[PDB]
Design a protein around this nucleic acid. Structure first.
Lengths: 127, 91, 97, 63, 214, 202, 25
RNA sequence: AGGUGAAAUUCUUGGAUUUAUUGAAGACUAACUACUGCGAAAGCAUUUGCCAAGGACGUUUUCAUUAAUCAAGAACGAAAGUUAGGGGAUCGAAGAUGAUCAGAUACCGUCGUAGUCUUAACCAUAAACUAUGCCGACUAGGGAUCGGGUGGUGUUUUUUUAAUGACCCACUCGGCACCUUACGAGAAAUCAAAGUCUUUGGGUUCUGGGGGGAGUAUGGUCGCAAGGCUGAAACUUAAAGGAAUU
């Protein structure tokens, strides 16, 4: 009864992504990022911006007709810091705060098999 | 007795053509020469006669081999690949 | 002076484990010496679950969580994180609190 | 501008480098049934109403 | 200055038949222009979603059946089964500390030449008298577990192709048929079918494709 | 007399007249004087046995291959060099394959392929050592050797000639777009200098 | 002075005096 | 978009980053993973097949001292380095530079060659750690845990109790470390051995003797090299060092 469409957020450091698409994905509808709602950098993966970003993608889906939003929060994953950054929170709260229809709330990060060697080094990123 | 310490069948090339070059040589040359073992008859009569060929000193089974050995590493790999997918065409 | 029975950590009975990559500076530190830390926290934060299982379809669904494994490498864990250092006596304390 | 009023109902400890900020837990005056943890500036008692110009937000421990 | 939505012609999503509420969702694409339309555009796409929302019982809060659009009969998308993967949130709760994991997998053909790799998870459990804080297998036991988990699949598959096969993934006959034979070997807990996927589909064959699309 | 990978003289039988018209099949690692070579669509996969790629599966190795069913061989004829069968498709009669160079040149699934790798293995993995075995080498090939270095010949006899030192003068990187006499060295070098890193493709 | 380094300093000065005696073997 | 204390370098009307259905490639085999398994050691963490193997155990099975440790000598020995083919995804000495800095040849960032990996060989070195020889017996209990085994008309098993399997109770050798005091031992730190040693002797290989000079000179010896091995002296100085307390 409700027009569906996953959100596929990108909770991570340095930036948050919030482009909602259809259940397939072949066709997307709106994207926008947090860094797009602030002129000063750093506060890119920031919640304040992640919210301001979730505010637009929000009003944008209301303008296309879809109501249902399946959040597929995704962490950087792979061979990097796999931990949803300060975005997937003030962004998921700014979604129900607008008035969208959240549902089938799940996650989908790029979980490997340790595979390749992460970047940094043996002693690593010391300082 | 001890003719050549580490220069076996290389004495035919005296001192010329430099060290490192010869070492590589002995490894190979020795290989192909040696009275090779014929998997057929079992008798090591299969002796390398001219590039990629190996004649048997009984029944004369002339084998299809390498330039300097009966079978290279990747040549036997051929065996399994075949035999593996060979049973999938009959079974 | 020697001040660690299990030494860096459990390696007794074998010779080579396999160093997992730090989850902070990607540094390579052996599985044993590696300070484990499970993070299975939910998908939300505070009263977020409120307007969540509220402004959301389904009664409440089941409210899923995130099951991830963290691996610091001493230095990282001793940033004021999981340790606060210890006392020689109670250095051999194996407990969650 | 979606303006919202907040009521001081739970004044906690303090954060910040100098610690001049306090982590207060307030409830909305226009449809509460929900609490948000914002921060403050100077003095606060659990009986003061603030005016948050941010509908969605929150903050706790600050370096 | 063209605005995509200006051409974006909405559609929908219809299941095969074996399921229940075929009515999944709607979708958007580029309107059928002169020379290259939307009818012969995508289709090679998918519909990764919870089987509980396409079944009717929200109890199946896991297992997302993946689809692959084939025919677009007037807006209505007549997609078919393309596989079934496991939710990471649920499979991450399944792997606890102090236990062992037994994963199997095997490729096979149905009866209408359908090649697909069915996966099958399995875990070990305690008993109504276990004292030790943990539980593990004898490694050789895990060999008989994999020996039979994979055996179970290929034994009673090729039954009406993926048709009744998908109609066996829903009733979780495997999960219980798995722990049923594996009873004379070790307790076991959870024991799900994990995931499964299509990698070699026969012909478009709209003959058996429409036995469900009706 | 001039090639390093045995030439099998397979005397065939003529089905159009009681006759044995001897054909020629490049020799492949694993054959010998007494193997039974079978060729054609319905011929069970075995070393020597040759038939269309559509008639075999992915991975299968071969040499002395067609390009179009009928050119009586062509590719992978030299010492060793074989070719794998990757991407496929029953209809269209097309089998994407991998060559010695590592070329992903797609061909017909009806193209003839002599199963097995060519008996010549690890040849250039052995030093010629003395100038002689190089002389006698091309002696039964072509008088393409011993080649003289360009800078040696004088300006008249070759572009790289002359100078009071021995140097070339201008980049020996001639454009793939010059002509007879103009071309002399590195023709169409999409790179030049010591090769290091990502090669074979991207 | 980290010993591993005191070991490399002498490593070059040891390989250094191998070539000076090769010049007058 | 990347990325950081923050920027930057960098990538972007050629539509990146991002999303999606796919493709190939090399690598890896996480989560399960343990004060756990086996290996002489270095180690060895996906599946199935194959090819042998080793240990524990159980044994009214067998030979019958065949034995323990071991300068010379012989095999395997991480990674780095190396010779040459195949492969070269990630990372990444070098280098390039972007910064901060007084400077930064540094750490932080982006790209990236050897290497990375395999094939045939080399190379024989690690704080190769248990900084702790091998072999035996004895001096101590506890509870775990690991592999086999003894017994329990025991748990659980329902197609019938069929049979076993897992599990619990005591036992049990061999694993694995751990906890508990010290009777003893130890400069202390600490340790079921580092105990059974001034009441000083179970067999036994090696090694060391203030500190530097120096694992250097030298020569010899192995090695393609790097360098391994073998290894001085002169001279100078009264401390070096250990452990622990303040």
């Amino acid at each position: 009864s409700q027009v569906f469409g996953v959100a596929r957020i990108y909770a991570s450091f340095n930036d948050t992504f919030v482009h909602v698409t259809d259940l397939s994905g072949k066709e997307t509808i709106a994207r926008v990022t947090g860094g797009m709602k602030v002129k000063a950098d750093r506060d890119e993966s920031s919640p304040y911006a992640a919210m301001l970003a979730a505010q637009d993608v929000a009003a944008k889906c209301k303008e296309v007709g879809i109501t249902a939003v399946h959040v597929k929060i995704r962490a950087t994953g792979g061979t990097r810091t796999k931990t949803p950054g300060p975005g997937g929170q003030a962004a998921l709260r700014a979604l129900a705060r607008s008035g969208l229809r959240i549902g089938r709330i799940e996650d989908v990060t790029p979980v490997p098999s340790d595979s390749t060697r992460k970047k940094g080094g043996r002693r690593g990123r010391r300082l | 007795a001890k003719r050549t310490k580490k220069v076996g069948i290389t004495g035919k090339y005296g001192v010329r053509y430099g060290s490192s070059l010869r070492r590589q040589v002995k490894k190979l040359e020795i290989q192909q020469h040696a009275r090779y073992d014929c998997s057929f008859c079992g008798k090591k009569t299969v002796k390398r006669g001219a590039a990629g060929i190996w004649t048997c000193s009984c029944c004369k089974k002339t084998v299809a081999g390498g330039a300097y050995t009966v079978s290279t590493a990747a040549a036997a790999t051929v065996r399994s690949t075949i035999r593996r997918l060979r049973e999938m065409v009959e079974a | 002076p020697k001040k660690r029975a299990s030494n860096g950590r459990n390696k007794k009975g074998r010779g080579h484990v396999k160093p997992v990559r730090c989850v902070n500076c990607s540094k390579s530190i052996p599985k044993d010496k590696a300070i484990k830390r499970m993070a299975i926290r939910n998908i939300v934060e505070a009263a977020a679950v409120r307007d969540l299982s509220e402004a959301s379809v389904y009664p409440e669904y089941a409210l899923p969580k995130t099951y991830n494994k963290l691996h610091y490498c001493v230095s990282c864990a001793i940033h004021a994180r999981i340790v606060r250092v210890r006392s020689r006596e109670d250095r051999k304390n194996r407990a969650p609190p | 501008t979606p303006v919202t009023l907040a009521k001081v109902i739970k004044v906690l400890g303090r954060t910040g480098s100098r610690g001049g900020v306090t982590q207060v837990r307030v409830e909305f005056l226009e449809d509460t049934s929900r609490t948000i943890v914002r921060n403050v500036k100077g003095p606060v008692r659990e009986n003061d109403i603030l005016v948050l110009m941010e509908s969605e937000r929150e903050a706790r421990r600050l370096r | 200055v063209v605005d995509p939505f200006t051409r974006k012609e909405w559609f929908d999503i219809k299941a095969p038949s074996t399921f229940e509420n075929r009515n999944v969702g709607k979708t958007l694409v580029n309107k059928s222009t002169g020379l290259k339309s939307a009818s012969d555009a995508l289709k090679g796409r998918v519909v990764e979603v919870c089987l509980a929302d396409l079944q009717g019982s929200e109890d199946h809060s896991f297992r997302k059946i993946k689809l692959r659009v084939d025919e677009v009969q007037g807006k209505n998308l007549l997609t078919n089964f393309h596989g079934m993967d496991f939710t990471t949130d649920k499979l991450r709760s399944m792997v606890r500390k102090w236990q062992t994991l037994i994963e199997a997998n095997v490729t096979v053909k149905t009866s209408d030449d359908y090649v697909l790799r069915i996966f099958a998870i399995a875990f070990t459990r305690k008993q109504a008298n276990q004292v030790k804080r943990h539980s593990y297998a004898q490694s050789s036991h895990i060999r008989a577990i994999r020996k039979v988990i994979s055996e179970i699949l290929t034994k009673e598959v090729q039954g009406s192709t993926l048709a009744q096969l998908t109609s066996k993934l829903i009733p979780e006959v495997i999960n219980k048929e798995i722990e049923n034979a594996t009873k004379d070997i070790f307790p076991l807990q959870n024991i799900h079918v994990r995931k499964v996927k299509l990698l070699k589909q026969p012909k478009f064959d709209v003959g058996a494709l429409m036995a469900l699309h009706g | 007399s001039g090639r390093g990978a045995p030439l099998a003289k397979v005397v065939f039988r003529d089905p159009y007249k009681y006759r044995l018209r001897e054909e020629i099949f490049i020799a492949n690692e694993g054959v010998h004087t007494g193997q039974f070579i079978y060729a054609g669509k319905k011929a069970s996969l075995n070393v020597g046995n040759v038939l269309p790629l559509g008639s075999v599966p992915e991975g299968t190795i071969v040499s002395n291959v067609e390009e179009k069913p009928g050119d009586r061989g062509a590719l992978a004829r030299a010492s060793g060099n074989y070719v794998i069968i990757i991407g496929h498709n029953p209809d269209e009669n097309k089998t994407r394959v991998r060559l010695p160079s590592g070329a992903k040149k797609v061909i017909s699934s009806d193209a003839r392929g002599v199963i097995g790798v060519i008996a010549g293995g690890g040849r250039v993995d052995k030093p010629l050592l003395k100038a002689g075995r190089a002389f006698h080498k091309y002696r039964l090939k072509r008088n393409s050797w011993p080649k003289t270095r360009g800078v040696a010949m004088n300006p008249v006899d070759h572009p790289h000639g002359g100078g009071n030192h021995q140097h070339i003068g201008k980049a020996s990187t001639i454009s793939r777009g010059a002509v007879s006499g103009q071309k002399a060295g590195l023709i169409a070098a999409r790179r030049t200098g010591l090769l290091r890193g990502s090669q074979k493709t991207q | 002075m980290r010993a591993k380094w005191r070991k490399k300093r002498t490593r070059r000065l040891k390989r250094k005096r191998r070539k000076v005696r090769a010049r007058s073997k």
